[PDB]
Design an enzyme around this catalytic site. Structure first.
Site, PDB file in Angstrom:
ATOM      1  N   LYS A  36     -42.402   4.993  59.969  1.00  0.00           N
ATOM      2  CA  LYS A  36     -41.844   3.708  60.371  1.00  0.00           C
ATOM      3  C   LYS A  36     -42.443   3.272  61.693  1.00  0.00           C
ATOM      4  O   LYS A  36     -42.324   3.971  62.674  1.00  0.00           O
ATOM      5  CB  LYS A  36     -40.327   3.809  60.485  1.00  0.00           C
ATOM      6  CG  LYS A  36     -39.589   2.481  60.471  1.00  0.00           C
ATOM      7  CD  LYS A  36     -38.094   2.711  60.638  1.00  0.00           C
ATOM      8  CE  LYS A  36     -37.306   1.572  60.062  1.00  0.00           C
ATOM      9  NZ  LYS A  36     -37.346   1.577  58.578  1.00  0.00           N
ATOM     10  N   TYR A  86     -39.748  10.848  52.157  1.00  0.00           N
ATOM     11  CA  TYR A  86     -40.332   9.831  51.291  1.00  0.00           C
ATOM     12  C   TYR A  86     -39.580   9.822  49.975  1.00  0.00           C
ATOM     13  O   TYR A  86     -39.381  10.870  49.363  1.00  0.00           O
ATOM     14  CB  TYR A  86     -41.826  10.099  51.089  1.00  0.00           C
ATOM     15  CG  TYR A  86     -42.408   9.518  49.826  1.00  0.00           C
ATOM     16  CD1 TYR A  86     -42.387   8.161  49.586  1.00  0.00           C
ATOM     17  CD2 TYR A  86     -43.009  10.333  48.884  1.00  0.00           C
ATOM     18  CE1 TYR A  86     -42.930   7.636  48.441  1.00  0.00           C
ATOM     19  CE2 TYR A  86     -43.558   9.819  47.738  1.00  0.00           C
ATOM     20  CZ  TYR A  86     -43.517   8.473  47.518  1.00  0.00           C
ATOM     21  OH  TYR A  86     -44.069   7.963  46.365  1.00  0.00           O
ATOM     22  N   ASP A 130     -23.938  -0.876  57.509  1.00  0.00           N
ATOM     23  CA  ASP A 130     -25.037  -1.059  56.531  1.00  0.00           C
ATOM     24  C   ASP A 130     -24.666  -0.619  55.087  1.00  0.00           C
ATOM     25  O   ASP A 130     -23.684  -1.131  54.529  1.00  0.00           O
ATOM     26  CB  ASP A 130     -26.322  -0.357  57.010  1.00  0.00           C
ATOM     27  CG  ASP A 130     -26.163   1.161  57.172  1.00  0.00           C
ATOM     28  OD1 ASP A 130     -25.750   1.628  58.267  1.00  0.00           O
ATOM     29  OD2 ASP A 130     -26.477   1.887  56.197  1.00  0.00           O
ATOM     30  N   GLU A 134     -30.641  -2.324  50.130  1.00  0.00           N
ATOM     31  CA  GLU A 134     -31.981  -2.122  50.670  1.00  0.00           C
ATOM     32  C   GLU A 134     -32.081  -0.817  51.466  1.00  0.00           C
ATOM     33  O   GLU A 134     -33.184  -0.386  51.795  1.00  0.00           O
ATOM     34  CB  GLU A 134     -32.396  -3.297  51.569  1.00  0.00           C
ATOM     35  CG  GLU A 134     -32.286  -4.676  50.919  1.00  0.00           C
ATOM     36  CD  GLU A 134     -30.943  -5.340  51.191  1.00  0.00           C
ATOM     37  OE1 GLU A 134     -30.951  -6.497  51.681  1.00  0.00           O
ATOM     38  OE2 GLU A 134     -29.886  -4.707  50.921  1.00  0.00           O
ATOM     39  N   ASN A 135     -30.934  -0.212  51.797  1.00  0.00           N
ATOM     40  CA  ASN A 135     -30.870   1.020  52.597  1.00  0.00           C
ATOM     41  C   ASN A 135     -30.479   2.206  51.738  1.00  0.00           C
ATOM     42  O   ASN A 135     -30.076   3.247  52.247  1.00  0.00           O
ATOM     43  CB  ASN A 135     -29.860   0.892  53.727  1.00  0.00           C
ATOM     44  CG  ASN A 135     -30.369   0.070  54.873  1.00  0.00           C
ATOM     45  OD1 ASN A 135     -31.445  -0.509  54.798  1.00  0.00           O
ATOM     46  ND2 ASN A 135     -29.591   0.002  55.947  1.00  0.00           N
ATOM     47  N   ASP A 148     -30.873   4.329  56.957  1.00  0.00           N
ATOM     48  CA  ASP A 148     -30.515   4.511  58.355  1.00  0.00           C
ATOM     49  C   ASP A 148     -29.100   4.092  58.712  1.00  0.00           C
ATOM     50  O   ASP A 148     -28.325   3.618  57.875  1.00  0.00           O
ATOM     51  CB  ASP A 148     -31.490   3.750  59.243  1.00  0.00           C
ATOM     52  CG  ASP A 148     -31.804   4.502  60.509  1.00  0.00           C
ATOM     53  OD1 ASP A 148     -31.762   5.744  60.435  1.00  0.00           O
ATOM     54  OD2 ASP A 148     -32.078   3.874  61.562  1.00  0.00           O
TER      55      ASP A 148
END
Ligand SMILES: *Cc1cc(-c2c[nH]c3ncnc(N4CCOCC4)c23)ccc1O
Length: 250
Positions: A36, A86, A130, A134-135, A148
């Site tokens: 990142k 990953y 969150d 998307e997370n 995260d």
């Protein structure tokens, strides 16, 4: 303890806003991971220095299958880089896009793996927000995996957090209901095309079910989506709600 000269970067996994995420290989082990990039340009104007370098220390000592492992981090002159697990099947976001809606089995399984990943975080006295699709990444076996912990878009925020009140760990059970709804219906329950509308929806907890949502989900969702925190089930109960058990996976 780590530098970019140790990794050959590869394909962009995702991009936008404050930096990029690249697939990469750690040279001396041939380990495949994800990098990142931040540029620190946004470290200024967000003052989010120490920010994460603090969250980094926190997450880096967390371990669980449904939680994306963070390995380390390092300072460029310009950029800041994070070293994460990953996740070979990408985001739940992309799959929700690809499939429109999920069936009860995939919905209730994701919800399980999430519920477990949270109680562990609670147990390490970690709470948050969150959990936007998307997370949520997917491991090689299809297992969910939480990205995260860190205006915004609002629609996963709970009423207490947007009214400005105080919030405990019960924030995460709001979230669970929000996702389980999004997972079954394709869109989140308080979606609007205005931050101001969504805000209203959320604080008055105004959602309706399309017909194809079964009673067992309506129930679970409903119980999680209550303006009053102390009236939200405990994670332990969520994991054992019939509709979960009935539909969840081994
Ligand atoms: C900071 C961050 C990192 C990732 C991430 C970690 N591992 C991945 N494997 C595949 N894809 C992705 N992403 C990154 C962003 O766009 C594509 C999905 C991975 C995920 C989210 C995140 O905030």
């Amino acid at each position: 303890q780590w530098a970019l000269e140790d990794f050959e970067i590869g394909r962009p996994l995702g991009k936008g806003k404050f930096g990029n995420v690249y697939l990469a290989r750690e040279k001396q082990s041939k380990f495949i991971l994800a990098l990142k990039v931040l540029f620190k340009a946004q470290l200024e104007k967000a003052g989010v220095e120490h920010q994460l370098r603090r969250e980094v220390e926190i997450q880096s000592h967390l371990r669980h299958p449904n939680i994306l492992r963070l390995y380390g981090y390092f300072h460029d002159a310009t950029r800041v880089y994070l070293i994460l697990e990953y996740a070979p099947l990408g985001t739940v976001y992309r799959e929700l896009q690809k499939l429109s809606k999920f069936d009860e089995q995939r919905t209730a399984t994701y919800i399980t793996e999430l519920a477990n990943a949270l109680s562990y975080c609670h147990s390490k006295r970690v709470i948050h927000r969150d959990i936007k699709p998307e997370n949520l990444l997917l491991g090689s076996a299809g297992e969910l995996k939480i990205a995260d912990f860190g205006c915004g878009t609002l629609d996963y925020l709970p009423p207490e957090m947007i009214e400005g009140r105080m919030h405990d760990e019960k924030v995460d059970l709001w979230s669970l209901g929000v996702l389980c709804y999004e997972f079954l219906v394709g869109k989140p329950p308080f979606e609007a095309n205005t931050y101001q509308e969504t805000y209203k929806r959320i604080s008055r907890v105004e959602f309706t079910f399309p017909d194809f949502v079964t009673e067992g989900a309506r129930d679970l969702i409903s119980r999680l989506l209550k303006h009053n925190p102390s009236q939200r089930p405990m994670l332990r109960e969520v994991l054992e709600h019939p509709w979960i058990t009935a539909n969840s996976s081994k």
